[PDB]
Amino acid sequence: MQDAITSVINTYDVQGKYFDTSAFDKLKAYYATGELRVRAAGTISANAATIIKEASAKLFSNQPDLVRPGGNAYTTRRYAACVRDMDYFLRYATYAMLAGDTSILDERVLNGLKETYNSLGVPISSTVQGIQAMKEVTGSLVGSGAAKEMGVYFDYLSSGLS
Amino acid sequence: MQDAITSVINTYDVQGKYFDTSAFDKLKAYYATGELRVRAAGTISANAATIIKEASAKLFSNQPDLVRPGGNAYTTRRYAACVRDMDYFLRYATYAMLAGDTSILDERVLNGLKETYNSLGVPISSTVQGIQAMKEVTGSLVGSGAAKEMGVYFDYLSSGLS
Amino acid sequence: MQDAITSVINTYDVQGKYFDTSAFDKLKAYYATGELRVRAAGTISANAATIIKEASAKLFSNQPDLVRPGGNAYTTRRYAACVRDMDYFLRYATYAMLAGDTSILDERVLNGLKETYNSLGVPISSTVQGIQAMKEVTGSLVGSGAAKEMGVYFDYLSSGLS
Amino acid sequence: TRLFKVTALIPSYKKVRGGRELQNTYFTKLVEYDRWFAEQQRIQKQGGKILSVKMVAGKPGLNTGV
Amino acid sequence: PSFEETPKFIEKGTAPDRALPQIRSAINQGVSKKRDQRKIFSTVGIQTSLASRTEFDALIRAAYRQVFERDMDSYRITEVFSVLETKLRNREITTKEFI
Amino acid sequence: TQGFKPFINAILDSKEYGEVFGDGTVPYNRYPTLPAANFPNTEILYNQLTKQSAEVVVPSFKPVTSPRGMDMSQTPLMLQAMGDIAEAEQEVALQKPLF
Amino acid sequence: SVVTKAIVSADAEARYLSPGELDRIRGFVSSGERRLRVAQTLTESRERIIKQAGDQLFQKRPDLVSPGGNAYGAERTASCLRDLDYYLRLVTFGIVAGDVTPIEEIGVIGVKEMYRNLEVPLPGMVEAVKAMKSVATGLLSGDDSAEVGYYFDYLAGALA
Amino acid sequence: SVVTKAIVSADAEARYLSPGELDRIRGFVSSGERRLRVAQTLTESRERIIKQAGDQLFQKRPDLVSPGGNAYGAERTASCLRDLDYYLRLVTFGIVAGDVTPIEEIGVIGVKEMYRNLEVPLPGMVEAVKAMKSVATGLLSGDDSAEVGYYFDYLAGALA
Amino acid sequence: SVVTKAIVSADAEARYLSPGELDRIRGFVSSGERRLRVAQTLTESRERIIKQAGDQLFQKRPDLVSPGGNAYGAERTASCLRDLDYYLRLVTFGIVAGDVTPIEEIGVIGVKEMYRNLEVPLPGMVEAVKAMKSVATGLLSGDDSAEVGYYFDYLAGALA
Numbered sequence A, B, C: 001m002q003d004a005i006t007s008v009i010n011t012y013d014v015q016g017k018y019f020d021t022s023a024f025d026k027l028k029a030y031y032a033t034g035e036l037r038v039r040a041a042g043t044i045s046a047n048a049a050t051i052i053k054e055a056s057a058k059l060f061s062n063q064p065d066l067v068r069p070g071g072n073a074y075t076t077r078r079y080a081a082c083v084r085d086m087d088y089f090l091r092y093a094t095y096a097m098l099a100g101d102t103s104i105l106d107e108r109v110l111n112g113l114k115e116t117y118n119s120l121g122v123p124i125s126s127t128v129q130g131i132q133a134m135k136e137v138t139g140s141l142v143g144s145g146a147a148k149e150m151g152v153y154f155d156y157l158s159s160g161l162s
Numbered sequence D: 001t002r003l004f005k006v007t008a009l010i011p012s013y014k015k016v017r018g019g020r021e022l023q024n025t026y027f028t029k030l031v032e033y034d035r036w037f038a039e040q041q042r043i044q045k046q047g048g049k050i051l052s053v054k055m056v057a058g059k060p061g062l063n064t065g066v
Numbered sequence E: 001p002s003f004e005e006t007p008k009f010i011e012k013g014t015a016p017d018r019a020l021p022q023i024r025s026a027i028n029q030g031v032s033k034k035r036d037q038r039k040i041f042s043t044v045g046i047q048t049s050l051a052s053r054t055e056f057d058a059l060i061r062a063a064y065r066q067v068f069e070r071d072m073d074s075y076r077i078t079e080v081f082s083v084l085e086t087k088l089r090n091r092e093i094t095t096k097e098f099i
Numbered sequence F: 001t002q003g004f005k006p007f008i009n010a011i012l013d014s015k016e017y018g019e020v021f022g023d024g025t026v027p028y029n030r031y032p033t034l035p036a037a038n039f040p041n042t043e044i045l046y047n048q049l050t051k052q053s054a055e056v057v058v059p060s061f062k063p064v065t066s067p068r069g070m071d072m073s074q075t076p077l078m079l080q081a082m083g084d085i086a087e088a089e090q091e092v093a094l095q096k097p098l099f
Numbered sequence G, H, I: 001s002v003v004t005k006a007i008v009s010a011d012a013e014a015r016y017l018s019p020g021e022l023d024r025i026r027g028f029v030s031s032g033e034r035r036l037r038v039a040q041t042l043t044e045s046r047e048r049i050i051k052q053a054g055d056q057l058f059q060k061r062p063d064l065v066s067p068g069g070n071a072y073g074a075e076r077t078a079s080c081l082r083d084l085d086y087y088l089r090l091v092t093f094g095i096v097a098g099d100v101t102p103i104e105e106i107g108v109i110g111v112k113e114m115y116r117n118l119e120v121p122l123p124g125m126v127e128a129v130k131a132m133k134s135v136a137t138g139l140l141s142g143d144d145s146a147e148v149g150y151y152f153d154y155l156a157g158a159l160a
């Protein structure tokens, strides 16, 4: 995985170029948002269990069939695995938010995820709905400025799964 | 693995046959070539670093983009891995020539090499070019008959990669 | 390990007290010494290989029999191990000086060093002489004030070894 | 029997490592009985000197309960 | 004028022109960055269990994630291996015996 | 013949485990360069999530004992040896009495 | 502390501290007087903070002090306020140390098992520490309040 | 990078980033503009630095450009100065990244193998790197010179 | 030696030595007499080999004995020749052993760290070893030169 700094470093390395004005512009842009990202990351970390609570409550309210018998989230085991997955998504979305890059989402989360869910019978659309629900809860938690920029990575996960 | 002796043994073991005159003739032919094979192996072993240096020099002279920034042999890791693969090819070609049999080339070199390189983005045509440069360098050092013999194993590697 | 601050925190936790004037005073003492400690640690970090060179040169000049055949520092492996151990002692003394407490020396360096050296046959007296030789060299570089502070941890290592 | 308490020193000969290795050379560990032959053989093959081995859990000479 | 030509070392190290599709593939070509973007957990400390509790705990959870491919809190691995973790912390056993 | 625990012990008591991981480090993906095909197979295994696939990545290794054709008896130095054995046989023949 | 974390990070890679770690240690030392002042502020108002936090906790969670609650009765309510006092002292320790290490190794490691042995509900703990966050960070200026709120939020997320 | 290192560590323990890691990233991000200024200063003078370092190196080591030397000739001297340019570029990348990781990952691992295959003398490389360090620390102030010399010393120690 | 390698390979498989391994040991003991003759020949020509090897090294690399060189001075040049004598003794040990294992155990493991600490240039080592190889092979016949030069080649590769 690469953060924004290493993203610029890697593009200029594979082009064999020294940093030009555009590179320093992107680097300034990353450094300018670093406090926002760090504060949002700390807020999300302190309230991770809460976010999972409201997001799973919303997902199971809108889709009661998931946790009733015959649903993919019907057992204590499969319910716990669903909330574990939601914790995965929140934690890695916070990683991507801190890094300012979606590379970790491709490398560490989305790789093999669709085929694994298809192999397990996990509903992918319902998982996308749960990810969206985490998006609204986290946005309500961290404020609009951080909300949009966390939503970038949430919708990246949603699009990668869909 | 197999050598010439083991190959004759296996072909007479599948038939449940004791050795005939033909098998003894094949064993005599290998025992006659053994001295030349050991001479060529010792020469190659003494000169492996020279061969790798020269062959990689021709390869990177003809394909300069491999060592320009962004090329597959551009970093100290990837250059070192490239010359390490060349050393591997030289060593296993020497093993094969000393055995008189290409089974080691399939078993310990060619098995999964193509999709190893394809999963890594290693160019296969440039690897074959490196192998041909290595063959040309080795032929000059081992002498005409040993050059023809060593070309067989280098060409086996090149054809298996292609 | 614990530093000076963690030592004060632990001594106040054991008695279940909030910080009083004396605790804040000891803290202020540490933050007063902090700049000196950081400067000395950086100086040693820049000059580690050097300090090791003069320390080993002094040890072997004063005790030449250690490196002639029959000495425990006679081989490339054993000489390399000797200078490796001296580099470890310097690095951990620097850690202890920066922390301001000698717990790291007992926790990491001295825990089991007697058993290991005596079973291997490493002479303790010569290693202590090497500690003193390293201390004398380091004091010349760090500065007059920081020299005594670093010597504190060097004598701690020596007495633990002695 | 079921448990040996083994104190062993394993020196290094192959190379000098950047890692400290004070962890791995002089050690004491608890190896269960039917692992001890393999463990002792491996320690001897690495070049170490087994300093001591002790009974801790079981009773020597017992037939059942092994 | 005093013309100042481009130095030869500039041209000796230039890269072929690459659009974004080639830049992306040139970044991610060889062995994956996971090979060097990771932590290797080992029992470097020989001090008692009282201090460096957190690094023992991290090593234990790393052992769980390596042997079982992920966290296994749903299966109560901590209480299943509580005696084993206790022996690891007080250094009765090594990492290999824990594994 | 022995089941699961003897099999795990056989892995962990191997020389390879002792040399690579010793007694202190948690195992990890090694990205092994050797032997041939170990890298792709290991990467397929380590790029899969838990329960991602139940298929066997390495069912077995295709034997290389015998190929089809390419006898290598037409090999030029083999041809030279077959020429030389004729000379040796002829010398042995002339060793016999002339009559 | 911050210094200990930097030293352990350097030791894991077996190297001397990089100029980044030394600059971080310099910044930590330069912030020492301010953090001792913050800790002294929170320490001198220990009783105010503990009683206001306990009041808010019981207002928002009356079931704790109702019959069948873990804090019902005089002695149980006293030991509740006593644990609040522990956690406040741990927060001051973390403030002076510059990290959450004192809190982590005195009050977080094994806290779930300890409150499971005592029937102490963890939502009650997180609500108590959030009330104590509000009460304590009310006393500090913005720069002090945010930095103390980091420790309080870490505590709340660790209990939850 | 510092952020990448923090995220990799947090991912290893499968946890969120600690307050200490967040404070480390806060410090690294606060110094971003200064490090960008240092890197831009080095970048604006790549040609001057490379030429002066080459002159100093070949005065120290006249044999490398003598007939039969490794850098003998215009094109081989150009390849030598190009290697110096590569390492200057990696040093600037490391300056903006905040650690030696770009230098480590592009120009250090397997560098002895590469130069052994190129029959390039390692002490010559060490002299060239020290020459670059002197020239480049010349163009900076006292505060920036130490930080840049840290990366140069790392590279030099890696080469020998 | 060869016997020790055969024994450890057999013990790795927990077996007795195969007829092939026994035949290998038989060939080894057959070659032992020629090996001792070669080692005796190099042992007799101690001072010659050291003298010409040192002279060729110092003429080929005057910088080592020149001011600022690592071997400047009578005592440092004496230490240089002493190291050459060490390595020639190791090569004799390798000749008797039949392999480079004694050279490996006494003078190759950790040699780079030793010469880094001593500030000894490794290329100077390689050139001194090549000069020793030339003198030793010259003092030998055509047959002995190959097997003796193999050990010097291994040693130079270890230093390089």
Ligand SMILES: CCC1=C(C)/C(=C/C2=NC(=C\c3[nH]c(/C=C4\NC(=O)[C@H](C)[C@H]4CC)c(C)c3CCC(=O)O)/C(CCC(=O)O)=C2C)NC1=O
Pocket (backbone or CB within 6 Å): A066, A072, A073, A077, A078, A079, A081, A082, A083, A085, A086, A088, A108, A109, A113, A116, A120, A122, A123, A124, A126, A127, A130, E070, F049, F050, F051
């Ligand atoms: C960090 C990257 C990563 C991801 C993303 C990941 C997903 C993942 N989810 C799994 C199981 C599961 N995941 C779910 C989640 C579903 N339940 C409901 O239907 C929802 C629609 C939906 C969640 C919102 C469920 C129910 C299971 C249990 C499947 C089973 O055991 O049969 C598994 C199988 C192994 C295990 O349980 O640990 C994986 C690998 N694993 C990873 O290593």
Ligand SMILES: CCC1=C(C)/C(=C/C2=NC(=C\c3[nH]c(/C=C4\NC(=O)[C@H](C)[C@H]4CC)c(C)c3CCC(=O)O)/C(CCC(=O)O)=C2C)NC1=O
Pocket (backbone or CB within 6 Å): B060, B067, B068, B073, B074, B075, B076, B079, H064, H070, H071, H072, H076, H077, H079, H080, H081, H083, H084, H086, H087, H106, H107, H118, H120, H121, H123, H124, H125, H128
């Ligand atoms: C980004 C990391 C990286 C590095 C550093 C790197 C170095 C590198 N230097 C090379 C050649 C060279 N390198 C040098 C430099 C040496 N000459 C003197 O001896 C000096 C001691 C020393 C330089 C200070 C020379 C002279 C050559 C030309 C070799 C020849 O023409 O035979 C080559 C061969 C391919 C080519 O020239 O394009 C590489 C790959 N490659 C990389 O991917």
Ligand SMILES: CCC1=C(C)/C(=C/C2=NC(=C\c3[nH]c(/C=C4\NC(=O)[C@H](C)[C@H]4CC)c(C)c3CCC(=O)O)/C(CCC(=O)O)=C2C)NC1=O
Pocket (backbone or CB within 6 Å): C066, C072, C073, C077, C078, C079, C081, C082, C083, C085, C086, C088, C089, C108, C109, C116, C120, C122, C123, C126, C127, C130, D011, D012, D016, D017, D020, D021, D022, D023, D025
């Ligand atoms: C980070 C804390 C730590 C330290 C410092 C440490 C020291 C240490 N030194 C060792 C060996 C050694 N140590 C020495 C050094 C001595 N020989 C000479 O007499 C000198 C006077 C003296 C050094 C000043 C030597 C020569 C050996 C090799 C012994 C052997 O041949 O087995 C070993 C055995 C394994 C190895 O060789 O790597 C350890 C573990 N271990 C640790 O866990």
Ligand SMILES: CCC1=C(C)/C(=C/C2=NC(=C\c3[nH]c(/C=C4\NC(=O)[C@H](C)[C@H]4CC)c(C)c3CCC(=O)O)/C(CCC(=O)O)=C2C)NC1=O
Pocket (backbone or CB within 6 Å): B066, B072, B073, B077, B078, B079, B081, B082, B083, B085, B086, B088, B089, B092, B108, B109, B110, B113, B116, B120, B122, B123, B124, B126, B127, B130, E029, E030, E031, F031, F032, F033, F034, F035, F036, F037, F038, F039
């Ligand atoms: C003995 C049989 C055998 C072979 C040959 C083999 C090759 C092999 N080459 C690899 C990587 C590689 N291989 C190359 C080879 C070069 N790329 C350049 O473009 C050239 C065209 C080409 C050589 C002439 C490169 C650049 C890498 C990348 C190394 C990295 O990413 O770190 C890897 C991945 C593991 C590693 O690098 O540690 C393997 C397994 N493996 C085997 O078991």
Ligand SMILES: CCC1=C(C)/C(=C/C2=NC(=C\c3[nH]c(/C=C4\NC(=O)[C@H](C)[C@H]4CC)c(C)c3CCC(=O)O)/C(CCC(=O)O)=C2C)NC1=O
Pocket (backbone or CB within 6 Å): C060, C067, C068, C073, C074, C075, C076, C079, I064, I070, I071, I072, I076, I077, I079, I080, I081, I083, I084, I086, I087, I106, I107, I114, I118, I120, I121, I123, I124, I125, I128
């Ligand atoms: C048996 C295996 C073994 C070896 C090889 C060995 C090498 C060795 N060489 C040393 C000194 C030395 N060695 C040299 C030799 C160098 N001078 C020039 O650069 C030449 C390139 C080169 C000689 C060919 C010099 C000059 C010193 C003195 C170092 C000093 O005083 O700074 C020392 C320091 C102790 C002493 O001086 O007695 C050792 C341990 N030790 C061993 O136990």
